[PDB]
Amino acid sequence: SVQIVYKPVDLSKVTSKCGSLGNIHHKPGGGQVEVKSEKLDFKDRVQSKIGSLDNITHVPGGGNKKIETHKLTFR
Amino acid sequence: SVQIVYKPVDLSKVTSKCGSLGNIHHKPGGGQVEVKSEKLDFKDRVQSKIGSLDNITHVPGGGNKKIETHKLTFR
Amino acid sequence: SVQIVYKPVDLSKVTSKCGSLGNIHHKPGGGQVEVKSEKLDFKDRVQSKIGSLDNITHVPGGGNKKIETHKLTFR
Amino acid sequence: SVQIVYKPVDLSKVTSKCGSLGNIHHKPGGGQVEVKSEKLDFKDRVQSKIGSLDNITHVPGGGNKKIETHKLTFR
Amino acid sequence: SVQIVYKPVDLSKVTSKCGSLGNIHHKPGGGQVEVKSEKLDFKDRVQSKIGSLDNITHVPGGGNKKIETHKLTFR
Amino acid sequence: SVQIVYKPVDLSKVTSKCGSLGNIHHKPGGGQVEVKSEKLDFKDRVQSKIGSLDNITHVPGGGNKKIETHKLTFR
Amino acid sequence: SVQIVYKPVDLSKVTSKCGSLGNIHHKPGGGQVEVKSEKLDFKDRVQSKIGSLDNITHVPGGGNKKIETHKLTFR
Amino acid sequence: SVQIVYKPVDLSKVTSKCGSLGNIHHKPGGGQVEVKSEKLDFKDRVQSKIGSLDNITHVPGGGNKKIETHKLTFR
Amino acid sequence: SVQIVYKPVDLSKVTSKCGSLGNIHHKPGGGQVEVKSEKLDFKDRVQSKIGSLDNITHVPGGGNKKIETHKLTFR
Amino acid sequence: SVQIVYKPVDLSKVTSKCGSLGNIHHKPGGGQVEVKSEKLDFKDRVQSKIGSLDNITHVPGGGNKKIETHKLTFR
Ligand SMILES: O=C(O[C@@H]1Cc2c(O)cc(O)cc2O[C@@H]1c1cc(O)c(O)c(O)c1)c1cc(O)c(O)c(O)c1
Ligand SMILES: O=C(O[C@@H]1Cc2c(O)cc(O)cc2O[C@@H]1c1cc(O)c(O)c(O)c1)c1cc(O)c(O)c(O)c1
Ligand SMILES: O=C(O[C@@H]1Cc2c(O)cc(O)cc2O[C@@H]1c1cc(O)c(O)c(O)c1)c1cc(O)c(O)c(O)c1
Ligand SMILES: O=C(O[C@@H]1Cc2c(O)cc(O)cc2O[C@@H]1c1cc(O)c(O)c(O)c1)c1cc(O)c(O)c(O)c1
Ligand SMILES: O=C(O[C@@H]1Cc2c(O)cc(O)cc2O[C@@H]1c1cc(O)c(O)c(O)c1)c1cc(O)c(O)c(O)c1
Ligand SMILES: O=C(O[C@@H]1Cc2c(O)cc(O)cc2O[C@@H]1c1cc(O)c(O)c(O)c1)c1cc(O)c(O)c(O)c1
Ligand SMILES: O=C(O[C@@H]1Cc2c(O)cc(O)cc2O[C@@H]1c1cc(O)c(O)c(O)c1)c1cc(O)c(O)c(O)c1
Ligand SMILES: O=C(O[C@@H]1Cc2c(O)cc(O)cc2O[C@@H]1c1cc(O)c(O)c(O)c1)c1cc(O)c(O)c(O)c1
Ligand SMILES: O=C(O[C@@H]1Cc2c(O)cc(O)cc2O[C@@H]1c1cc(O)c(O)c(O)c1)c1cc(O)c(O)c(O)c1
Ligand SMILES: O=C(O[C@@H]1Cc2c(O)cc(O)cc2O[C@@H]1c1cc(O)c(O)c(O)c1)c1cc(O)c(O)c(O)c1
C-alpha cells in the first residue's frame, strides 16, 4: 500500500515588457586560426567544435526558459 | 502504508520592465590562434571546443530561467 | 505508516524596472594564442575549452534565475 | 508513525529599480598566451579552460538569483 | 511517533533603488602569459583554468542572491 | 673665360650573391580602422594616404639603388 | 679665368655574400585605430599618412644604396 | 685665375659575408590607438604620420649605404 | 691665383664576417595609446610621428654606412 | 698666391668577425600612454615623436659607421 497524491500547481507570470531594441551594430573583424592534428579517436557521446571561427548574434524579443522535471520511481 | 501528499503552489511574477535598449556597438578585432596536437582519444560524455575563435552577442529582451526538479523515490 | 504533507507556497515578485540601456561600446583588440600538445586522453564527463579566443556580450533586459529542487526519498 | 507537515511560505519582493545604464566603454587590448603540454589525462567530472583568452561583458538589467533546495530522506 | 511541524515564513524586501550608472570606461592593457607543462593527470571533480588571460565586466542593475537550504533526515 | 673639365669615372661592382630565399610565411591578422573628418582642403604638392589598411611584401632578389645627380649652373 | 679639373674616380666593390634566408614567420595580430578630425588644411609639400594600419615586410637579397651628388655653381 | 684640381680616389671594399639567416619569428600583438583632433594647418615641407599602427620587418641580406656629396661654389 | 690640389685617397675594407643569425623571436604585446589635441599649426620643415604605435625589426646581414662630404667654396 | 696640397690617405680595416648570433627572445609587454594637448605651433626644423609607443630591434651583422667631412673655404 503506497499511495501518491501528486498535485503541483504552477502559476508563473513569466513576462517581459521590452520597448524598442534601438541601434545594434556588430562588426566582427577578421582573424586567423591554424590547428593541426593527425589522428582523432573518440567513442560514445560527443559534442565537439574543432577550429570553429564564427559570429553568433542571438537577440530574442523575450528569453524565457521554464524547465520542470518530475521523476517518480518504485523499484 | 506510505502516503505522500505533494502540494507545491508556485506563484512567481517573474517579470521585467525594460525600456529602450539604446545604442550597442561591438567591434571585435582580429586575433590569431595556433594550436597543434597529434592524437586525441576520449570516451564517453564530452562537450569540447578546440581552437574556437568566435564572437557571441546574446541580448534577450528578457532573461528568465525557472528550473524546478522534483524527484520522489521508493526503493 | 509514513505520511508526508508537503505544502510549499512560493510567492516571488522577482521583478526588475530597468530604464534605457544607454550607449554600450565594446572594442576587443586582437591577441595571439599559441598552444601545443601531443596526446589528450580523458574518459567520462568533460566540458573543456582549449585555445578558445572569444568575445561574449550577454546583456539581458532582465536576469532572473529561480531554481527549486525538491527530493523525497524512502529507502 | 512518522508524520511530516512541511509548510514553507516564501514571500520575496526581490526587485530592482535601476535607471539609465549610461555610457559603458570597454576596450580590451591585445595580449599573447603561449602554453605547451604533451599529454593530458583526466577521468570523470571536469570543467576546464586551457589557454582561453576572452572578453566577457555580462550586463543584466537585473541580477536576481533565488535558490531553494529541500531534501527529505527516510532511510 | 516523530511529528515535525515545519513552518518557515520568509518575508524579504530584497530591493535596490539605483539611479544612473554613469560613465564606465575600461581599458585593459595587453599582457603576456607563458606557461609550460608536460603531463597532467587528475581524476574526479575539477574546475580549473590554466593560462586564462581574460577581461570580465559583470555589471548587473541589481545583484540579489537568496539561498535557502532545508534538509530533514531520519535514519 | 670659364672652362670646365668634368670627368667622373664611376666603376661600381654593385653585386649580390644570394642563395635560396627559404620559407617565408606572412599571416597578417584582421584589424579595424575608424576615422572621421568633415572638410579637407589642401593646395599644391601632396602625397597622402588616409585610412589605408594594407599588407605590402616587397622581396627583391637584389635591392640596388644607384643615384647620381650632377648640376652645373652659370648665372 | 676659372678652370675646373673635376676627376673623381669611384671604385666601389659594394657586394654581399648572403647564404640561405631560412625560415621567416610573420604573424601580425589585429589592432584597432580610431581617429577623428573635422577640418584639415595644408598648402605645399606634404607626405602624410593618417590612420594607416599596415604590415610591411621588405626583405631584399641585397640592400645597396649608393648616392653621389655633385654641384658646381658659378654666380 | 682660380684653378681647381679635384682628384678623389675612392676604393671601398664595402662587403658582407653573411651565412644563413636562421629562424626569425615575429608575432606583433594587437593594440588600440585613439586620437582626436579638430583642425590641422601646416604649410610647406612636412613628413608626418598620424595614428599609424604598423609592423615593419626590413631584413636585407646586406645593408650598405655609401653617400658622397661634393659641392664646389664660386660666387 | 688660388690653386687647389685636392687628392683624397680612400681605401676602406669595410667588411663583416657574420655567421648564422640563429633563432630570433619577437612577441610585442598589445598596448593602448590615447592622445587628444584640437589645433596643430606648423610651418616649414617637419618630420613628426603622432600617436604612432609600431614594431620595427631592422636586421641587415651587414650594416655599413660610409658618409663623405667635401665642400669647397670661394666667395 | 694660395696653394693647397690636400692629400689624405685613409686606410681603414674596419672589420668584424662575428660568430653565431644565438637565441634572442624579445617579449615587450603592453603599456598605456595617455597624453592631452590643445594647440601646437612650431616653425622651422623639427623632428618630433608625440605619444609614440613602439618596439625597435635593430640587430645588424656588422655595425660600421665611417664619417669624413672636409671643408675648405676662402672668403
Ligand atoms: O551614436 C553615434 O553617433 C551617430 C553618428 C554621429 C556623427 O557621425 C556625428 C555627430 O555629430 C553625431 C552623430 O550622432 C549619431 C547618432 C546615432 C544614434 O543612433 C543616436 O541615437 C544619436 O542620438 C546620434 C555613433 C554610432 C556609431 O555606430 C559609430 O560608429 C559612431 O562613431 C558614432
Ligand atoms: O557617443 C558618441 O558620440 C556620438 C558621436 C559624436 C561626435 O562624433 C561628435 C560630437 O560632438 C558628439 C557626438 O555625440 C554622438 C552621440 C551618440 C549617441 O548615441 C548619443 O546618445 C549622444 O548623445 C551623442 C560616440 C559613439 C561611438 O560609437 C564612438 O565610437 C564615439 O567615439 C563616440
Ligand atoms: O562620451 C563620449 O563623448 C562623445 C563624443 C564627444 C566628442 O567627441 C567631443 C565632445 O566635445 C563631446 C563629446 O560627447 C559625446 C557624448 C556621447 C554620449 O553618449 C553622451 O551621453 C554625451 O553626453 C556626450 C565618448 C564616447 C566614446 O565612445 C569615446 O570613445 C570617447 O572618447 C568619448
Ligand atoms: O567623459 C568623457 O568626456 C567626453 C569627451 C569630451 C571631450 O573630448 C572634450 C570635452 O571638453 C568634454 C568631453 O566630455 C564628454 C562627455 C561624455 C559623457 O558621456 C558625459 O556624460 C559628459 O558629461 C561629457 C570621456 C569619455 C571617454 O570615453 C574618454 O575616453 C575620455 O577621454 C573622456
Ligand atoms: O572626466 C573626464 O573628463 C572629461 C574630459 C574633459 C577634458 O578632456 C577636458 C576638460 O576641460 C574637461 C573634461 O571633462 C570631461 C567630463 C566627463 C564626464 O564624464 C563628466 O561627468 C564631466 O563632468 C566632465 C575624463 C574622462 C576620461 O575617461 C579620461 O580619460 C580623462 O582623462 C578625463
Ligand atoms: O619550422 C617549422 O616547423 C615545421 C613543422 C614541424 C612540425 O609541425 C612538427 C615537427 O616535429 C617538426 C616540424 O618542422 C617543420 C620544419 C619546417 C621547415 O621549414 C624546416 O626548414 C624544418 O627543418 C622543419 C614551423 C613552421 C611554421 O610555419 C610554423 O607555424 C610552426 O609552428 C613551425
Ligand atoms: O615548413 C613547414 O612545414 C611543412 C609542413 C610539415 C608538417 O605539416 C609536418 C611535418 O612533420 C613537417 C612539415 O614540414 C613541411 C616542410 C615544408 C617546407 O617548405 C620545407 O622546406 C620543409 O623542409 C618542410 C610549414 C609551412 C607552413 O606554411 C605552415 O603553415 C606550417 O605550419 C609549417
Ligand atoms: O623552430 C621551431 O620548431 C619547429 C617545430 C617543432 C616542434 O613543434 C616540436 C619539436 O620537438 C621540434 C620542432 O622543431 C621545429 C624546427 C623548425 C625549424 O625551422 C628548424 O630549423 C628546426 O631545427 C626545428 C618553431 C617554429 C615556430 O614557428 C614556432 O611557432 C615554434 O613554436 C617553434
Ligand atoms: O627554439 C625553440 O624550440 C623549438 C621547439 C621545441 C619544442 O617545442 C620542444 C623541444 O623539446 C625542443 C624544441 O626545440 C625546437 C628548436 C627550434 C630551433 O629553431 C632550433 O634551432 C632548435 O635547435 C630547436 C622554440 C621556438 C619558438 O618559436 C618558440 O616559441 C619556443 O617556445 C621554442
Ligand atoms: O631555448 C629555448 O628552449 C627550446 C625549447 C625547449 C623546451 O621547451 C624544453 C627543453 O627541455 C629544452 C628546450 O630547448 C629548446 C632549444 C631551442 C634552441 O633554439 C636551442 O638552440 C636549444 O639548444 C634548445 C626556448 C626558446 C623560447 O622561444 C622560449 O620561449 C623558451 O621558453 C625556451
Short mmCIF file of C-alpha atoms and ligand atoms in Angstrom, two decimals, chain A residues 23 25, chain B residues 22-23 25 27, chain C residues 22-25 27, chain D residues 23 25, chain F residues 34 36, chain G residues 34 36, chain H residues 34 36, ligand 2:
data_model
loop_
_atom_site.label_atom_id
_atom_site.label_comp_id
_atom_site.label_asym_id
_atom_site.label_seq_id
_atom_site.Cartn_x
_atom_site.Cartn_y
_atom_site.Cartn_z
CA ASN A 23 20.51 50.52 -32.86
CA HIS A 25 25.92 47.44 -34.75
CA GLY B 22 19.88 52.13 -26.77
CA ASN B 23 22.93 52.07 -29.00
CA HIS B 25 28.30 48.88 -30.83
CA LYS B 27 33.76 45.79 -32.88
CA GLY C 22 22.30 53.75 -22.92
CA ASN C 23 25.36 53.62 -25.13
CA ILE C 24 27.48 50.46 -24.85
CA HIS C 25 30.68 50.33 -26.91
CA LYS C 27 36.10 47.13 -28.90
CA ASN D 23 27.80 55.16 -21.26
CA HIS D 25 33.07 51.77 -22.99
CA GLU F 34 37.52 54.04 -37.95
CA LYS F 36 36.04 60.60 -39.38
CA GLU G 34 40.02 55.27 -34.03
CA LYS G 36 38.64 61.84 -35.53
CA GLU H 34 42.52 56.50 -30.11
CA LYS H 36 41.26 63.07 -31.68
O1 LIG K 2 28.52 58.73 -28.08
C1 LIG K 2 29.23 59.00 -29.02
O2 LIG K 2 29.22 60.19 -29.65
C2 LIG K 2 28.44 60.33 -30.87
C3 LIG K 2 29.35 60.91 -31.93
C4 LIG K 2 29.64 62.36 -31.67
C5 LIG K 2 30.65 63.03 -32.36
O3 LIG K 2 31.37 62.34 -33.30
C6 LIG K 2 30.93 64.36 -32.12
C7 LIG K 2 30.19 65.05 -31.17
O4 LIG K 2 30.46 66.36 -30.93
C8 LIG K 2 29.18 64.42 -30.46
C9 LIG K 2 28.91 63.08 -30.72
O5 LIG K 2 27.90 62.50 -29.99
C10 LIG K 2 27.33 61.33 -30.60
C11 LIG K 2 26.24 60.79 -29.71
C12 LIG K 2 25.83 59.47 -29.85
C13 LIG K 2 24.83 58.96 -29.04
O6 LIG K 2 24.44 57.66 -29.18
C14 LIG K 2 24.22 59.76 -28.08
O7 LIG K 2 23.24 59.26 -27.29
C15 LIG K 2 24.63 61.09 -27.95
O8 LIG K 2 24.02 61.87 -27.00
C16 LIG K 2 25.63 61.60 -28.76
C17 LIG K 2 30.23 58.07 -29.60
C18 LIG K 2 29.81 56.83 -30.08
C19 LIG K 2 30.74 55.97 -30.62
O9 LIG K 2 30.39 54.74 -31.11
C20 LIG K 2 32.08 56.33 -30.68
O10 LIG K 2 32.98 55.46 -31.22
C21 LIG K 2 32.49 57.57 -30.20
O11 LIG K 2 33.82 57.88 -30.28
C22 LIG K 2 31.57 58.44 -29.66
#
